[PDB]
Amino acid sequence: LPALKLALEYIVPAMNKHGICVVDDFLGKETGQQIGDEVRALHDTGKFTDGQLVIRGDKITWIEGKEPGCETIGLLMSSMDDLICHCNGKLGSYKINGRTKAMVACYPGNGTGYVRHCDNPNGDGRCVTCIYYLNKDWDAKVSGGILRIFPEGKAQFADIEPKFDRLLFFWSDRRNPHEVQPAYATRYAITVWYFDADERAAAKV
Amino acid sequence: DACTLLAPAAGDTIISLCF
Ligand SMILES: O=C(O)CNC(=O)C(=O)O
Ligand SMILES: [Mn+2]
Numbered sequence: 773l774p775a776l777k778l779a780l781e782y783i784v785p786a787m788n789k790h791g792i793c794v795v796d797d798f799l800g801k802e803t804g805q806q807i808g809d810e811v812r813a814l815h816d817t818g819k820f821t822d823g824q825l826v827i828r829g830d831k832i833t834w835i836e837g838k839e840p841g842c843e844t845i846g847l848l849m850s851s852m853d854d855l856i857c858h859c860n861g862k863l864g865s866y867k868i869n870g871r872t873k874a875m876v877a878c879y880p881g882n883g884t885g886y887v888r889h890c891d892n893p894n895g896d897g898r899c900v901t902c903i904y905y906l907n908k909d910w911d912a913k914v915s916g917g918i919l920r921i922f923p924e925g926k927a928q929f930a931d932i933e934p935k936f937d938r939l940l941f942f943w944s945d946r947r948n949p950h951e952v953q954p955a956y957a958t959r960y961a962i963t964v965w966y967f968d969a970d971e972r973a974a975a976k977v
Numbered sequence: 978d979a980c981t982l983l984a985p986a987a988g989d990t991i992i993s994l995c996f
Binding site: 823824825826827828834836853856857860868869870871872873875887888889890891892893894896897898922924946949963965966967972 | 993
């Protein structure tokens with residue numbers, strides 16, 4: 773899959789038309805596994821704390837990608853960034869000029885999850901959500917942990933399985949209310965949000 | 978509107994991007 777062509781050819785039309793975009797097998801088996809190993813490596817540290825709101829049953833940690841031993845995570849973020857900036861101007865009307873750090877989040881199992889919410893209800897500047905799923909051979913039927921999105925204007929449901937090496941894009945605003953149904957198995961994911969310049973200016977005001 | 982105000986903390990810093 774040509775990196776920069778995938779954007780204009782799939783992610784851009786998919787996101788504009790339907791509002792959600794999924795890219796399976798983004799990097800490959802060995803890459804994804806190196807990411808997972810680095811993540812669980814971080815998981816043994818014990819530096820994970822409870823997730824925060826602007827209910828949610830995950831423990832997370834922020835990664836900038838510049839940390840030693842997180843080289844592969846940084847590689848991922850560099851890819852996502854290259855894609856975004858390459859898209860810039862084409863995604864809806866957005867002009868993306870920033871992003872958050874990476875949120876490495878873990879659901880312990882035990883049925884905890886994230887109640888129905890919206891990532892940017894108040895217009896804080898976040899216009900796109902990216903989530904990288906690295907959970908290998910995840911059996912949703914028994915493991916739950918499904919991401920259910922309720923698209924605005926569409927009658928159908930959007931059910932995302934946290935499959936390993938899966939990349940997820942969607943509008944962060946009120947167009948995509950989502951929830952993480954109870955997870956009965958360890959559920960790891962890496963997130964990052966992308967900021968629109970103008971809306972970002974509005975939030976300061 | 979099926980939204981809720983229970984948004985994930987956007988975090989602490991923002992990273993410059995593209996320009
Ligand atoms: O990890 C997922 O599938 C969904 N997570 C969230 O909606 C969040 O962290 O705010
Ligand atoms: Mn969310």
